[PDB]
Amino acid sequence: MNCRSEVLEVSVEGRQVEEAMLAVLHTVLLHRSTGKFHYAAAGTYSIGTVGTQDVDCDFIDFTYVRVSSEELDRALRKVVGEFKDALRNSGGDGLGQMSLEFYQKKKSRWPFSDECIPWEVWTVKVHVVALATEQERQICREKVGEKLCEKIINIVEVMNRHEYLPKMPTQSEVDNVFDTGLRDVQPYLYKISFQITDALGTSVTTTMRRLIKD
Amino acid sequence: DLNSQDRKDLDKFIKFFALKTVQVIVQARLGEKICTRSSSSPTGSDWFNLAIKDIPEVTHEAKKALAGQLPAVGRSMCVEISLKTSEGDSMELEIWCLEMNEKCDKEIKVSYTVYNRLSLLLKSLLAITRVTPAYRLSRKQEYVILYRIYFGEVQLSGLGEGFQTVRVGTVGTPVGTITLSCAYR
């Protein structure tokens, strides 16, 4: 089970960065979580039920669906905010990425911490641009929303395309596959991190991408 | 091959997946936002571990359409989302299509591997139904949205030349492969 990685790219206005990341992490996590496992000593276990809700974006003409866990939404909202202010204090560069990776924990011998083995990573590269009129702020609400549509479609296509998932664990091993720390929902073990990148050129891959258009 | 109750559990899963499919699609074109609560202590009606409330009229419409039959090669189930304006002009926005190919697969445990993958496909369907063009139109409502479930024989050309399609996803079972998608104008 070697690590699958996926990259999406978005160009957004300043106000739109938080919703667009929220739109992407929640749709991946909605596919990458499950009902709470409730084990009995005999080995038997039951699965709880996941609720979902629609979220209208305020700066994008867009709606996405998230699991109805409010600790989870709080969790991602705070680190999505840590990404955005980090972009704001980046001044010029204008770029930064965010990554979400799912991993299993393997028990390690003393003194080494359990090694965390990713089986899937998601990366979102953002390019903030600031807009001048308030009608290209309004018009921008529409095509960012149209572009997140196809980003959501692609995420969904990749998930059917992706075959490996962790073996479903026993009660002793469940904390090495799932985050059992939430009440509503059981996400796979996951880490999200980010980086503020420095800009440089785009490398005359343009001709390769221009061959695909023709 | 499949044991006797392997075949019947699979058939119960496909039925309720198909009934849940129409609920999600119709509830996403209904006009308003959908919010269901999670639950650590499950209920016996939350199929596939997902909280999806049933609309009774939609269940009945779904069941009459399937006529107690399940989709299979040739027999697909379709939800037609259409628009009738006050000028009486009617046109199909989308035709959601739950199909079944003959590519079988005796390598999946019917009981709970197929079950959890039907569940993920329902989760994809909740995501997808929000990001096709008919969704935003249905949330504004001049014109109203109409839904019709049928069991064909899928026929799409009313959508018009050049329509687009998106694959929601795919699930392999010992009786064939379940395909779900949307042709949209």
Side-chain angles (χ1 to χ4, degrees), chain A residues 2-3 5-17 19-73 75-89 91-92 94-106 108 110-136 138-140 142-162 164-207, chain B residues 2 5-6 8-36 38-40 42-74 76-86 88 90 92-102 104-105 108 110-135 137-139 141-145 147-152 154-160 162-185:
Chain A
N2 59 326
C3 190
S5 54
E6 299 288 343
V7 187
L8 327 185
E9 323 192 16
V10 301
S11 288
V12 312
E13 189 211 20
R15 321 179 313 181
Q16 315 187 305
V17 76
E19 283 169 347
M21 312 298 321
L22 283 173
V24 166
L25 310 150
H26 275 304
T27 104
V28 178
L29 270 157
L30 164 70
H31 294 78
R32 292 311 196 218
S33 68
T34 196
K36 302 278 304 168
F37 291 175
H38 283 235
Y39 288 95
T44 278
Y45 89 119
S46 61
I47 306 188
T49 62
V50 177
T52 58
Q53 58 188 275
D54 294 321
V55 173
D56 289 328
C57 291
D58 282 318
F59 308 116
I60 322 185
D61 278 2
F62 198 66
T63 291
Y64 62 90
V65 183
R66 58 171 180 85
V67 309
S68 308
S69 161
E70 226 67 9
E71 329 167 62
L72 175 72
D73 193 54
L76 315 173
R77 289 226 188 217
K78 159 145 107 197
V79 48
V80 154
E82 298 172 17
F83 175 61
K84 132 180 200 168
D85 69 335
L87 268 172
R88 204 140 283 200
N89 318 335
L95 317 162
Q97 54 177 74
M98 169 137 38
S99 275
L100 158 72
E101 101 181 68
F102 301 102
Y103 64 90
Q104 305 164 103
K105 282 180 177 192
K106 173 74 184 299
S108 270
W110 201 86
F112 327 91
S113 307
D114 320 75
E115 53 165 349
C116 305
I117 294 103
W119 47 281
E120 174 170 305
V121 182
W122 297 83
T123 314
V124 181
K125 300 175 178 154
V126 171
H127 178 35
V128 195
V129 313
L131 281 315
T133 88
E134 262 53 80
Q135 74 92 335
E136 39 171 26
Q138 173 281 321
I139 196 166
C140 219
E142 293 169 31
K143 320 83 154 192
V144 185
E146 272 153 57
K147 198 85 185 185
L148 293 157
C149 284
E150 30 171 281
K151 295 318 156 177
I152 296 342
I153 292 155
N154 287 135
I155 290 167
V156 168
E157 314 200 288
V158 153
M159 236 113 211
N160 293 267
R161 170 185 111 191
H162 275 199
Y164 174 79
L165 286 164
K167 183 109 205 170
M168 292 292 97
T170 62
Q171 150 97 7
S172 41
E173 275 287 62
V174 70
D175 273 306
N176 299 326
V177 173
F178 292 97
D179 183 353
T180 64
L182 286 181
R183 164 191 81 177
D184 320 75
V185 59
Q186 185 175 291
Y188 283 111
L189 279 168
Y190 75 95
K191 48 171 164 280
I192 86 167
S193 54
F194 64 79
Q195 252 282 299
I196 293 317
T197 61
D198 321 321
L200 209 269
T202 88
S203 134
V204 173
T205 67
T206 77
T207 333
Chain B
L2 279 191
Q5 262 57 31
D6 278 334
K8 295 163 213 211
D9 300 342
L10 178 59
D11 274 28
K12 185 181 66 169
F13 297 162
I14 283 147
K15 180 162 241 207
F16 279 97
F17 171 80
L19 295 165
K20 288 296 157 157
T21 293
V22 180
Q23 296 289 152
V24 174
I25 286 164
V26 169
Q27 291 181 36
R29 297 290 174 270
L30 195 39
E32 322 193 18
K33 290 202 272 282
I34 313 294
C35 186
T36 60
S38 290
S39 156
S40 191
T43 40
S45 70
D46 286 322
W47 283 90
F48 309 104
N49 312 306
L50 274 165
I52 302 163
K53 281 174 108 40
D54 295 321
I55 303 171
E57 318 75 286
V58 180
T59 305
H60 195 58
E61 280 312 315
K63 291 167 144 170
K64 285 185 319 181
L66 304 122
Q69 310 312 87
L70 301 171
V73 164
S76 298
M77 161 178 110
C78 306
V79 186
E80 182 188 65
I81 301 305
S82 62
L83 195 178
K84 162 210 159 191
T85 191
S86 56
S90 176
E92 321 82 90
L93 290 301
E94 328 163 299
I95 293 153
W96 297 81
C97 191
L98 174 41
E99 313 174 61
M100 178 97 245
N101 80 39
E102 90 281 0
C104 309
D105 188 337
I108 286 77
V110 153
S111 268
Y112 296 125
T113 295
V114 168
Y115 188 84
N116 298 322
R117 179 41 192 278
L118 295 174
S119 177
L120 196 67
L121 185 52
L122 273 179
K123 284 171 197 180
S124 303
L125 178 65
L126 285 156
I128 286 296
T129 56
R130 307 322 205 257
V131 304
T132 56
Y135 174 73
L137 183 69
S138 73
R139 287 282 308 282
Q141 216 156 267
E142 52 296 6
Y143 65 85
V144 284
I145 295 292
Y147 76 84
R148 166 184 157 250
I149 308 113
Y150 65 89
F151 196 71
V154 52
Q155 157 42 22
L156 311 160
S157 284
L159 292 174
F163 63 76
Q164 323 173 12
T165 81
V166 51
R167 169 78 95 257
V168 173
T170 275
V171 173
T173 85
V175 166
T177 298
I178 285 167
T179 298
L180 170 65
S181 48
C182 181
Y184 60 104
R185 168 171 67 203

